[PDB]
Amino acid sequence: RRALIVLAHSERTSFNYAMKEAAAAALKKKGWEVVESDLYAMNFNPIISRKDITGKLKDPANFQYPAESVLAYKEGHLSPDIVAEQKKLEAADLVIFQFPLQWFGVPAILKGWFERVFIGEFAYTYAAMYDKGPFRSKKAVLSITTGGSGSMYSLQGIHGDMNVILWPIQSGILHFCGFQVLEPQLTYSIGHTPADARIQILEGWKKRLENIWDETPLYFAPSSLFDLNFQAGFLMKKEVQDEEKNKKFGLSVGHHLGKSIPTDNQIKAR
Amino acid sequence: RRALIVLAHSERTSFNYAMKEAAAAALKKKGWEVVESDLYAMNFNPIISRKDITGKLKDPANFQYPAESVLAYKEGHLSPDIVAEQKKLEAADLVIFQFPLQWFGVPAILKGWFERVFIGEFAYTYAAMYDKGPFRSKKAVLSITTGGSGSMYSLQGIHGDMNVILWPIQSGILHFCGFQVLEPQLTYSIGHTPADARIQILEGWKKRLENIWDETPLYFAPSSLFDLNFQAGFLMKKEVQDEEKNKKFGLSVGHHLGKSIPTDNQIKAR
Numbered sequence: 001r002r003a004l005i006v007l008a009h010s011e012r013t014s015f016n017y018a019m020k021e022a023a024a025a026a027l028k029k030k031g032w033e034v035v036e037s038d039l040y041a042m043n044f045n046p047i048i049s050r051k052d053i054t055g056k057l058k059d060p061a062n063f064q065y066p067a068e069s070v071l072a073y074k075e076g077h078l079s080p081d082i083v084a085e086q087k088k089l090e091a092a093d094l095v096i097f098q099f100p101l102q103w104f105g106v107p108a109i110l111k112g113w114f115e116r117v118f119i120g121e122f123a124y125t126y127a128a129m130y131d132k133g134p135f136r137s138k139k140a141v142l143s144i145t146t147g148g149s150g151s152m153y154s155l156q157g158i159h160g161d162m163n164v165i166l167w168p169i170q171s172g173i174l175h176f177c178g179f180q181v182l183e184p185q186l187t188y189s190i191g192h193t194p195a196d197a198r199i200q201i202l203e204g205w206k207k208r209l210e211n212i213w214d215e216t217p218l219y220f221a222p223s224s225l226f227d228l229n230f231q232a233g234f235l236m237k238k239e240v241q242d243e244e245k246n247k248k249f250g251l252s253v254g255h256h257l258g259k260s261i262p263t264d265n266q267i268k269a270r
Numbered sequence: 271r272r273a274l275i276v277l278a279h280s281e282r283t284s285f286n287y288a289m290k291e292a293a294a295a296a297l298k299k300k301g302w303e304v305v306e307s308d309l310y311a312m313n314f315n316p317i318i319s320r321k322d323i324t325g326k327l328k329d330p331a332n333f334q335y336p337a338e339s340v341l342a343y344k345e346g347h348l349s350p351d352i353v354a355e356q357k358k359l360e361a362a363d364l365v366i367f368q369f370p371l372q373w374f375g376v377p378a379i380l381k382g383w384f385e386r387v388f389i390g391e392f393a394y395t396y397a398a399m400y401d402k403g404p405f406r407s408k409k410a411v412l413s414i415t416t417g418g419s420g421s422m423y424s425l426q427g428i429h430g431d432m433n434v435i436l437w438p439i440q441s442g443i444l445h446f447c448g449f450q451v452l453e454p455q456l457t458y459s460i461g462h463t464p465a466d467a468r469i470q471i472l473e474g475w476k477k478r479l480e481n482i483w484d485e486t487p488l489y490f491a492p493s494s495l496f497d498l499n500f501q502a503g504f505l506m507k508k509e510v511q512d513e514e515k516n517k518k519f520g521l522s523v524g525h526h527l528g529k530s531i532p533t534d535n536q537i538k539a540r
């Protein structure tokens with residue numbers, strides 16, 4: 001029912017802004033309740049600081065952000081801007097991340113949003129890691145625009161596999177917190193695209209969003225395959241290790257196991 | 271003879287600050303000229319904006335950061351803070367990036383530093399990308415500290431291969447600009463390390479820096495293996511494609527070619 005669009009672009013004149021508006025309008029049309037987070041427009045502070053904890057710190061002499069931020073969440077003393085974003089996430093069923101690819105990742109303003117908003121207990125638990133994480137009932141999507149062509153990001157392109165680039169965001173940030181990660185919306189070489197083709201990209205994104213919730217998510221190795229505790233080193237179960245010995249391919253981009261990475265692990269489902 | 275230490279930590283009480291001081295002292299002792307970039311202390315602005323261009327914009331109606339930033343570099347009207355950092359880089363032979371791992375990547379403040387400082391024509395060109403790029407005569411190192419243990423980042427750990435996490439920074443940011451990327455200094459689960467062991471870590475980092483310049487850099491596929499033109503799609507040369515058909519392993523993490531990733535591609539040189 002509810003969706004949150006997080007946008008990491010400065011210009012209203014950009015294709016990224018167009019893609020945000022396309023999504024918002026498409027979803028609203030299909031009966032969704034759409035909430036935005038235009039990070040630049042919000043003049044969002046992306047830097048984690050002691051200013052994110054409203055009152056007195058627990059140990060001001062040796063400030064440690066994870067410890068202090070959790071305490072601030074639990075005691076209700078987080079910075080109001082963080083709290084507002086946290087309330088937006090709690091509410092949302094679908095979370096869309098609309099951004100241009102910058103230095104083979106998320107723009108610094110989005111990275112800062114994750115660091116400041118995805119606080120301990122709220123977003124993650126060392127116990128409730130990955131598929132067990134807080135956002136297990138939510139679904140996330142990355143809608144990316146790149147300057148480089150798709151062939152550059154193919155297995156034989158100079159930049160190398162796009163699946164490798166996506167892994168730290170999709171597994172490390174999103175899946176880590178519980179999210180079911182849906183296929184990314186990859187819009188390559190947008191600067192080279194003529195006007196009519198751009199108008200089509202938008203129509204395609206809108207038609208996708210008509211049934212985005214019914215889609216099958218990307219594959220990540222289930223937490224059930226690992227002995228989750230410090231004594232075991234959070235390693236794959238010895239039984240799973242044995243079962244996988246006779247298997248031709250790895251499980252995911254990170255769990256490639258020095259075997260082949262299953263084709264488009266981070267780009268495609270099934 | 272010149273070195274630059276870029277530090278992405280708020281607290282002087284941190285092990286990251288200790289590691290910065292350790293490096294600075296070690297290098298200075300071995301006759302190096304050491305310059306710092308304590309991003310938090312500098313109160314560095316990590317957000318790319320039109321405020322990064324002091325002169326008249328080319329198209330203020332449709333602002334495009336890459337195009338305008340290059341023009342500002344060439345015409346000499348980039349933001350003085352950006353210029354100061356650019357002058358530091360121009361001077362440095364060795365560049366050390368001291369930071370805690372945050373959300374499987376660089377902290378937002380460092381990410382913003384790359385986005386705002388690594389401007390087109392200064393840090394890279396279309397022709398001068400990867401080996402045979404502007405910083406080809408420089409060497410870069412990542413000194414990372416993590417909360418999670420090394421086993422979590424092993425091929426069998428929950429987070430998966432650390433080599434996959436490193437790839438977008440080491441290849442995508444550093445090697446893309448010509449830097450020879452040296453073996454990363456990975457300091458795992460630093461919070462759990464006892465005092466005597468923490469001392470040993472610092473002493474080891476200092477002893478490494480005694481002969482850091484003479485080290486062999488990490489392997490990245492040379493640009494000479496690819497037909498770097500639009501007609502060809504920036505793909506590997508037909509002869510390279512064929513030669514690498516009978517080879518068990520891929521070239522790198524990103525150039526895995528659907529085969530096995532060579533062990534510790536992004537961690538070791540062998």
Ligand SMILES: Cc1cc2nc3c(=O)[nH]c(=O)nc-3n(C[C@H](O)[C@H](O)[C@H](O)COP(=O)(O)OP(=O)(O)OC[C@H]3O[C@@H](n4cnc5c(N)ncnc54)[C@H](O)[C@@H]3O)c2cc1C
Pocket residue numbers: 009011013014015016017018099100101102103104105145146147148190191195198199202318332333334335336385386
């Ligand atoms: C610091 C930095 C780092 C970067 N790193 C990378 C990298 O690692 N990899 C990479 O591949 N690229 C990289 N890039 C390039 C970047 O990914 C692209 O420039 C970006 O994705 C372009 O998208 P945009 O929203 O800015 O579009 P724009 O360039 O602003 O817009 C594209 C076109 O769409 C048009 N448009 C706008 N609205 C609409 C609409 N409603 N309907 C139709 N057309 C519309 C515009 O008028 C324009 O002609 C980097 C750029 C920067 C600034």
Ligand SMILES: Cc1cc2nc3c(=O)[nH]c(=O)nc-3n(C[C@H](O)[C@H](O)[C@H](O)COP(=O)(O)OP(=O)(O)OC[C@H]3O[C@@H](n4cnc5c(N)ncnc54)[C@H](O)[C@@H]3O)c2cc1C
Pocket residue numbers: 048064065066115116279283284285286287288369370371372373374375415416417418419460461465468469472
């Ligand atoms: C937003 C955020 C995201 C994170 N994401 C991740 C993630 O993706 N993966 C991950 O693994 N971790 C993650 N972490 C954890 C983070 O990487 C670590 O907590 C961090 O690396 C700890 O290093 P530190 O510099 O902060 O040292 P500290 O927190 O200060 O601890 C180091 C210890 O060494 C002591 N010490 C200080 N100076 C010296 C000295 N001179 N000699 C000896 N000992 C000294 C200190 O007193 C302390 O006991 C995240 C943390 C944050 C804040």
Ligand SMILES: O=C1c2ccccc2C(=O)[C@@H](Br)[C@H]1[C@H]1C(=O)c2ccccc2C(=O)[C@@H]1O
Pocket residue numbers: 103104146147148191334336337340390446
């Ligand atoms: O910003 C860019 C970049 C920066 C770092 C790594 C890869 C990249 C890219 O993919 C290239 Br295409 C580059 C941009 C780029 O340099 C550029 C310069 C002048 C006009 C337009 C552009 C772009 O739209 C490009 O996106």
